Amino acid sequence: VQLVESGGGLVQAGGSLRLSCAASGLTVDDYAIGWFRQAPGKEREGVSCISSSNGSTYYADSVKGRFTISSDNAKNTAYLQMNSLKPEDTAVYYCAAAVSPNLECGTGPFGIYASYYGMDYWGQGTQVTVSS
């Protein structure tokens, strides 16, 4: 199992960016794909989530409305469309998958107890920078 991020980089505030995550090696076709982010020194934040089975999604309050999550299952990939980007979105953005069945997006590492939960697999991360 391998997860490749792409689509990050620099943009101007009010710019947009489409993060891509390419999952090779998955066995199961009931799984959840997440985007997390972390800026040096702050705690990791779960940003968005999509279940391949039940179609549940989640967005952190800090990105609701601005970000939209989708998966093209043919190319085995998930996308985070990031619009109206702000300086506070600046961070390393990690793609992650969880393979336990019937995962409900917004629970576990997307809930209030997120610190207590992890994911089955992680990308290396891609830097996103929003200048003022």
Partner: peptide, 19 residues
Amino acid sequence: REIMENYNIALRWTAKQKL
């Protein structure tokens, strides 16, 4: 959370696993 921190682990994300 303290012990998991020390050991570089977390709870696996399952439909059922609580704290």
